[PDB]
Amino acid sequence: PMQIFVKTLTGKTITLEVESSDTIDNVKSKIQDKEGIPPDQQRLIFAGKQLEDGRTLSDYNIQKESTLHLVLRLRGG
């Protein structure tokens, strides 16, 4: 059990019900369902670092009431 928040650079928020054992992929895929972005096109950030597929939330020590960012832009200009 657990709750996390996903925020975009726009200040748009969605709430996800999640377990520490859930994959980043699992998460990205739930973001695709709400924000309509292919997981491969997402820059999901926690505490400053990009979240990679094949890991879990616990691997990144994301805990209850945490916030992830969804950066929806190419790097640089």
Partner: protein, 245 residues
């Protein structure tokens, strides 16, 4: 053959306005349940200011996002561009939410297009699970164009929307090739066939060596939906975005 000139001048006008703070934030905003033209820049800017303040200020925020300043002039990833150019093209007076559109899965692109009225403009939103991509196919009143951008994590290399329109935006694409690519059989094709199809349709310089198929999800799902549009309406929406200054 005089509308294609207008189509280019409209797309060029739109892409250039995006150097504008206001135009940049309104085009690529992510509120979908509202008419794109209803978007208020000042309001959108207050909501960013709100977010930043909420997180302790700009420096602290830029720490969380790993360097990303929410105020910067952005260029959209494939999903955000596709979703937003989709709205800008299809909307008149009722909000269209690309998040909540129903997609076709058990229908070939080839057999779907045959049902489409030729005297109408259509725009195809493609959600491609094989490439991890999402792009648009413009079907003017057959002729076909690609509108895309790409983060670059897949088989396709990173492309900024402004550059894609500028080099490949008014360059028609083979109907039949789109049928090959937008087939469930595409996953089965020979490596080089896949590579040239991707190169010809989605690579900026039509170059097979800029494509890496090893990065494809061979079991990913292809899904797409189309929607008619008034060219006048799209023009006008574009004018709103491009006129923010």
């Amino acid at each position: 053959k005089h509308r294609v000139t207008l189509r280019k001048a409209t797309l060029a006008s739109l892409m250039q306005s995006l150097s504008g703070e206001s135009s940049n934030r309104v085009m690529w905003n992510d509120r979908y349940d509202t008419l794109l033209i209803a978007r208020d820049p000042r309001e959108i800017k207050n909501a960013i200011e709100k977010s930043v303040t909420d997180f302790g200020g700009l420096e602290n925020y830029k720490e969380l996002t790993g360097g990303a300043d929410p105020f910067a002039l952005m260029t959209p990833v494939a999903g955000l561009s596709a979703n937003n150019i989709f709205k800008l093209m299809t909307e008149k007076d009722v909000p269209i939410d690309p998040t909540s559109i129903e997609y076709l899965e058990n229908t070939s692109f080839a057999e779907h297009v045959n049902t489409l009225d030729s005297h109408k403009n259509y725009v195809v939103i493609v959600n491609d699970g094989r490439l991890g991509h999402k792009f648009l196919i413009d079907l003017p009143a057959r002729t076909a164009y690609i509108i895309q951008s790409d983060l670059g994590g897949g088989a396709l290399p990173a492309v900024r929307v402004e550059d894609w329109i500028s080099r490949r935006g008014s360059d028609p694409v083979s109907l039949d090739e789109l049928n090959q690519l937008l087939s469930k059989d595409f996953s089965k094709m020979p490596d080089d066939v896949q590579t040239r199809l991707l190169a010809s349709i989605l690579q900026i310089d039509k170059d097979p060596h800029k494509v890496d198929i090893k990065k494809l999800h061979l079991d990913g799902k292809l899904r797409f939906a189309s929607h008619e549009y008034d060219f006048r309406q799209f023009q006008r929406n574009a004018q709103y975005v491009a006129g923010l200054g």
